[PDB]
Antibody, heavy 221, light 215 residues
Framework: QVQLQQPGAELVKPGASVKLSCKAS????????MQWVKQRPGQGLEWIGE????????NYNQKFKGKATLTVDTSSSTAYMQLSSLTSEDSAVYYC??????????????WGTGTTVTVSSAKTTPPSVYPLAPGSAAQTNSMVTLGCLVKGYFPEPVTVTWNSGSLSSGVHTFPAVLQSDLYTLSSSVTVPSSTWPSQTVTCNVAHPASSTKVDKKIVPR | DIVLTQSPASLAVSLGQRATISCKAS??????????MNWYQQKPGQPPKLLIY???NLESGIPARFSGSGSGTDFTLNIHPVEEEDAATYYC?????????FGGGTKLEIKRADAAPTVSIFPPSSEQLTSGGASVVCFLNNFYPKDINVKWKIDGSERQNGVLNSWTDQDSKDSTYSMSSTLTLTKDEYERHNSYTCEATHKTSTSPIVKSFNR
């Protein structure tokens, strides 16, 4: 299984720098060039540069020459990108992607999970997770909607799954909203009325930047 | 460098219809009868996915309803017939010269039949109350169109400050939207009132949809 893995997030102080990593697996690492792309919400995708792992030959986008440095470790099958003297404008999701050549035409066929980088003097804040139980009805429905409130965290992102992922149907996760330098997000899951009261339903939240995990069980009111 | 321009930026198409996405190159991306135009698809919270390379080559595993055409400076991505899972954002990318560049992207939306929202209201959790704050939450699930608004009424009175609203992107198997409204007050404010109501205004109804609870 071809895979490109990247850490979920990085919180950096303005004027500082970071080394983003991208671990490859499932293929001959040196057999293909590695690409790095930048994605800012609303702006779209931007190409940073490429590197040939076999000899470490690099090619940069003029715009990033002197901001990004690419290297690789053919021993551990890892590719790297250092970003220096970061500014708010550098906040974004960074992707590493495998390149492929077709009749001289280059395209990227496998993309990494992406890394959310946030530039700010603000400090990491783990989320406060609260269970949202209905606690009322009139036997007017066959399905029940439960939820979880993830509030007051920084920075993005957070991962929410239900019953470690066993529950995937009828699940909605709402994009986070920022208010007062802190993000708030919520998630819902709709299960059968015969399921919940008796079967334990739990919400699992992971916040990569703070390395914290919280599991909250939904208990009827 | 060669700039790519995608038109439009947003598109709404009906199920079973044809969606045509345009991409304009500032300069020719041709070379030996080979157009170096690639197309990617990106769904919310996911990395981009390769659809077509070299302008008209369908990557393996990609449904035949997707096709690409063009040469020189004009390219189009065609989806016919469009399906629900096709709700996403599409980007073109050229690999003729350096630097490599992408188009602004085009968000595709599926037009389906109206759907009224399912409303759920949740009072604050005991855990949250111990902390001195109080958040009342309302979920407005699986509706269409996405046009909707929520009003919060406390003891019959409208409240506007401390309300955070968030919509999801179009569903992948439903083509419906969902949204959550969160009303946050201090524990003392919450404890002085008894009736908490959230009423939604959607086109599938002449009168508001009300959902409430009493402390």
């Amino acid at each position: 299984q071809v895979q490109l893995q990247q850490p979920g997030a990085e919180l950096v102080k303005p004027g500082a720098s970071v080394k983003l990593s991208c671990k490859a697996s499932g293929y001959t690492f040196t057999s293909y060039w590695m690409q790095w792309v930048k994605q800012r919400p609303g702006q779209g995708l931007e190409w940073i540069g490429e590197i040939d792992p076999s000899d470490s030959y690099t090619n940069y986008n003029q715009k990033f020459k002197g901001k990004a440095t690419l290297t690789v470790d053919t021993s551990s099958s890892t590719a790297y990108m250092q970003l220096s003297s970061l500014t708010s404008e550098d906040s974004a999701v960074y992707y590493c992607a495998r390149n492929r050549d077709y009749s001289n035409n280059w395209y990227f066929d496998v993309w990494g999970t992406g890394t959310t980088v946030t530039v700010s003097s603000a400090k990491t804040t783990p989320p406060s997770v609260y269970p949202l139980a209905p606690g009322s009805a009139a036997q007017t429905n066959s399905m029940v909607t439960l939820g979880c409130l993830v509030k007051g965290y920084f920075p993005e992102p957070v991962t929410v799954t239900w019953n470690s992922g066993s529950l995937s149907s009828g699940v909605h996760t709402f994009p986070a909203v920022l208010q007062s330098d802190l993000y708030t997000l919520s998630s819902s899951v709709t299960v059968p009325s015969s399921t919940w009261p008796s079967q334990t339903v739990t919400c699992n939240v992971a916040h990569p930047a703070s390395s914290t995990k919280v599991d909250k069980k939904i208990v009827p009111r | 460098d060669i700039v790519l321009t995608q038109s439009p930026a947003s598109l709404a198409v009906s199920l079973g219809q044809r969606a045509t996405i345009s991409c304009k190159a500032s300069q020719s991306v041709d070379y030996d009868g080979d157009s170096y135009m690639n197309w990617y698809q990106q769904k919310p919270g996911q990395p981009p996915k390769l659809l077509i390379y070299a302008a008209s080559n369908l990557e393996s595993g990609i449904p035949a309803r997707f096709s690409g055409s063009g040469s020189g400076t004009d390219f189009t991505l065609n989806i016919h017939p469009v399906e629900e899972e096709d709700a996403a954002t599409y980007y073109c990318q050229q690999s003729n010269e350096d630097p490599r560049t992408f188009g602004g992207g085009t968000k595709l939306e599926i037009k389906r039949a109206d759907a009224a929202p399912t409303v759920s209201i949740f009072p604050p959790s005991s855990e949250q109350l111990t902390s001195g704050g109080a958040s009342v939450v309302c979920f407005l699930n699986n509706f269409y169109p996405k046009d909707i608004n929520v009003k919060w009424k406390i003891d019959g009175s409208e409240r506007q400050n401390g309300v955070l609203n968030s919509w999801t992107d179009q569903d992948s198997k439903d083509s419906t939207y969902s949204m959550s409204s969160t009303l946050t007050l201090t524990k003392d404010e919450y404890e002085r009132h008894n009736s908490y109501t959230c009423e939604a205004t959607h086109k599938t109804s002449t009168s508001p949809i009300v959902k409430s609870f009493n402390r």
